[PDB]
Design a protein around this nucleic acid. Structure first.
Length: 756
DNA sequence: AATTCGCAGTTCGCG
DNA sequence: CGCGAACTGCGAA
């Protein structure tokens, strides 16, 4: 099993290192033969003698062009001829590529920005994370001494905790009477002891929660003060810290540093992303939080260090438990994309698709398009029409069926061969013509993207068949993860087409896809209304809710089945309308906001305040309780009673403040805000006392009595003291509870004042 | 750093 | 000095 690749430099030449885990044993394969290269396209071949002579400087060392070779590849499915330019060292290409491009005889250059080690995985057909290998895993966490107004890592680490399959332990340098605490005398001995534990356990994976941006940097700065060689790497090296523009990321060579924080943030939508919140969300059991002020107080008073140790022990143990949950999923993604678990677990959607496409393009001798420069990026910010959204017939409905397309956008890409290499390609026998926008797509041969999509959707079906017949539960679960990653990959091509930073950007493909989608969905609505008597209540992009007014449940279901038989004999290719479910009642609030209840009693809510992080729990919990009264019992008087009780509970100050918190994410540097909302105003108070407010930070505030602007009265919930602070019951009634229930109960005759 | 389509709370500036 | 626009955030698909 391949884990990662990198390269070192020996006597001026690059040496690829392949980190493997084969049959329980860690190994390093070296490859000294791979040469870095990019491609150039010339106005004329004789200019190759001119370009061969171009040189550059790499702080001191003079960079030349090692060797050139003419090659023939396809660019967008068309044959082209370029010059492959080899170099002795990978760091030669950034120092020289701009000089070769700026030549008047060089038209452009291609594949000039592929990192050497990832280039190696692609060119050599290697795939990380394949085969029967258990990785040994170890999670860890630190606890520090914090005082407000000090630099980063001015204060010592107090505890390093770790957990794996054999338990959890805490290393600390005061006496704590707990069986899982090991005591040493100094912070230096504690860090050294933790070095030894990692070197002794020799894990394949190190799991942190936000180690990319706190734990490793803290350890780095302490190890510098204390004079410690921080040698975590299997090759004896120190953690390698790398800037990914805004934040940081940390490699441990020979190991996989699995940081849960970017993984969880990309995988699940939660109101906050504290370790305690993530654990309760994934596992359903509470984790108590101990705050920095308590940790410092306990350390300097020496009182209640047991509580700090237990908190530290639990940090590692839930971090390990979350590692076990999410690592296999990310391993399959790494195996699917063809890049390291380290890389993919920190990659956006667009980067993931692109690395997939670069490997597939290599295997088909397709020269890759370039990322856009500034001129081209500007040109690319024209938008296009999206999915169809019917304005709903607002209110309460009985006996609803939801009908929709099985994978509308990938079905359109497959069926109509929507690809930039088929777009308006002249001289074919057969084309499909996108409605409204007019783009022609050749059908004589499968496009690059359509072919990959077809392969993907077919592999997913073989896996599902293989899961149902396989007898090995670990194989079945890995298979499950792989077909899930494939579904997500396949559903990413559409958005990638319209992504201006994409190498394979194609506004025409993307707007063709949505145009075909609007055609298919609206023709279907028209047919079910005019030929089958249905009333279509609401519809968004690829599906719609419908009923027969005044028909019983079993009529609606059967007439829907018949319509499906009718419409699917008219839908071309892979387009298929499916019976997704029957809902006994549904309430449609606005476009993109509704709730339905199925015959079993389960309620599904979309877009409503219930699903949002920036609404208080008391609002959400109250709206949810209203929706049960209506959907489940059809009981409007109960719904009104529920809201009357809640506004009174707030008015007499008996709602717990924990249900009053509002969560809003900071989305940028704070000086780039043109207008200061309440959450920006709280984040400015906090940042003015040394707390870091990078983008992605979730402000958790509560609104206090007094008045003026909401921002003048907002404080972090951590700062809320129920003996010097009174929350604004009028704000939570007039601006939170009633605004979420009013748009629903307006359908029965109630106004906000009948609800107080 | 996937897309467009959409709702709504806060704040501020203007007749 | 109420109101609309602007900014802002987070949803659906």
């Amino acid at each position: 099993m391949i884990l990662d690749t990198d390269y070192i430099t020996e006597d001026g030449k690059p040496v690829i290192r392949i980190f493997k885990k084969e049959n329980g044993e860690f190994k390093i394969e070296y490859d000294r033969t791979f040469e870095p290269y990019f491609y150039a396209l010339l106005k004329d071949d004789s200019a190759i003698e001119e370009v061969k002579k171009i040189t550059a400087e790499r702080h001191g060392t003079v960079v030349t062009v090692k060797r050139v070779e003419k090659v023939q590849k396809k660019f967008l499915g068309r044959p082209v001829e370029v010059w492959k330019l080899y170099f002795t060292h990978p760091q030669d290409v950034p120092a020289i590529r701009d000089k070769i491009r700026e030549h008047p005889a060089v038209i452009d250059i291609y594949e000039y920005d592929i990192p050497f080690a990832k280039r190696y995985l692609i060119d050599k057909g290697l795939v990380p994370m394949e085969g029967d290998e258990e990785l040994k895993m170890l999670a860890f966490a630190i606890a520090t001494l914090y005082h407000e107004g000090e630099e980063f890592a001015e204060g010592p680490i107090l505890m390093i905790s770790y957990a794996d399959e054999e338990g959890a332990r805490v290393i600390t340098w005061k006496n704590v009477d707990l069986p899982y605490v090991d005591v040493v005398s100094t912070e230096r001995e504690m860090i050294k002891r933790f070095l030894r534990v990692v070197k002794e356990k020799d894990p394949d994976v190190l799991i942190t929660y936000n180690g990319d941006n706190f734990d490793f940097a803290y350890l780095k700065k302490r190890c510098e003060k204390l004079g410690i060689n921080f040698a975590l790497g299997r090759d004896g090296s120190e953690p390698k810290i790398q800037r990914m523009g805004d934040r940081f990321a940390v490699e441990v060579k020979g190991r996989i540093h699995f940081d849960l924080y970017p993984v969880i943030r990309r995988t699940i939508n939660l109101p906050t992303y504290t370790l305690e919140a993530v654990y309760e969300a994934v596992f359903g059991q509470p984790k108590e939080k101990v705050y920095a002020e308590e940790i410092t107080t306990a350390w300097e008073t020496g009182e209640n260090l047991e509580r700090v140790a237990r908190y530290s022990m639990e940090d590692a143990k839930v971090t390990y438990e979350l590692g076990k949950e999410f690592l296999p999923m990310e391993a399959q993604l790494s195996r699917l994309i063809g890049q390291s678990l380290w890389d993919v677990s920190r990659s956006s959607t667009g980067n993931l698709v692109e690395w997939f496409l670069l490997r597939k393009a290599y295997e088909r001798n397709e020269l890759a398009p370039n990322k856009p420069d500034e001129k081209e990026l500007a040109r690319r910010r024209q938008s296009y029409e999206g999915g169809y959204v019917k304005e709903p017939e607002r209110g309460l409905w009985e006996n609803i069926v939801y009908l929709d397309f099985r994978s509308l956008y990938p079905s359109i890409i497959i069926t109509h061969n929507v690809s930039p290499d088929t777009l308006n390609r002249e001289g074919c026998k057969e084309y499909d013509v996108a409605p409204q926008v007019g783009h022609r797509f050749c059908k004589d041969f499968p496009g690059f993207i359509p072919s990959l999509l077809g392969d993907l959707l077919e592999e997913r079906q073989k896996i599902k068949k293989k899961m149902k017949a396989t007898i090995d539960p670990i194989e079945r679960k890995l298979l499950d993860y792989r077909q899930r990653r494939i579904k997500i990959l396949a559903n990413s091509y559409y958005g990638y087409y319209g992504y201006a930073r994409a190498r394979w950007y194609c506004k025409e493909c993307a707007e063709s896809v949505t145009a075909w989608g609007r055609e298919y969905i609206t023709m279907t609505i028209k047919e079910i209304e005019e030929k089958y008597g249905f009333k279509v209540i609401y519809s968004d992009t690829d599906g719609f809710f419908a009923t027969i007014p005044g028909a019983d449940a079993e009529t609606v279901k059967k007439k829907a089945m018949e319509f499906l038989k009718y419409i699917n004999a008219k839908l071309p290719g892979a387009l298929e309308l499916e019976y997704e479910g029957f809902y006994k009642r549904g309430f449609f609030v606005t476009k993109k906001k509704y709730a339905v209840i199925d015959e079993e009693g389960k309620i599904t809510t979309r877009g409503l305040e219930i699903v949002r992080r920036d609404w208080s729990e008391i609002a959400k919990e109250t709206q949810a309780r209203v929706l049960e009264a209506l959907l489940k019992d059809g009981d409007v008087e109960k719904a009104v009673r529920i809201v009357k009780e809640v506004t009174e509970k707030l008015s007499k100050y008996e709602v717990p403040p924990e249900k009053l918190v509002i969560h809003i994410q900071i989305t940028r540097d704070l000086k780039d805000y043109k207008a200061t909302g309440p959450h920006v105003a709280v984040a400015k108070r906090l940042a003015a006392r040394g707390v870091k407010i990078r983008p992605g930070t979730v402000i958790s505030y509560i609104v206090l009595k007094g008045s003026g602007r909401i921002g003048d009265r907002a404080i972090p919930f951590d700062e809320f003291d129920p003996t010097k602070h009174k929350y604004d019951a009028e704000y939570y009634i007039e601006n939170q509870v009633l605004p979420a229930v009013e748009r629903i109960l307006r359908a029965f005759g109630y106004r906000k004042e009948d609800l107080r």
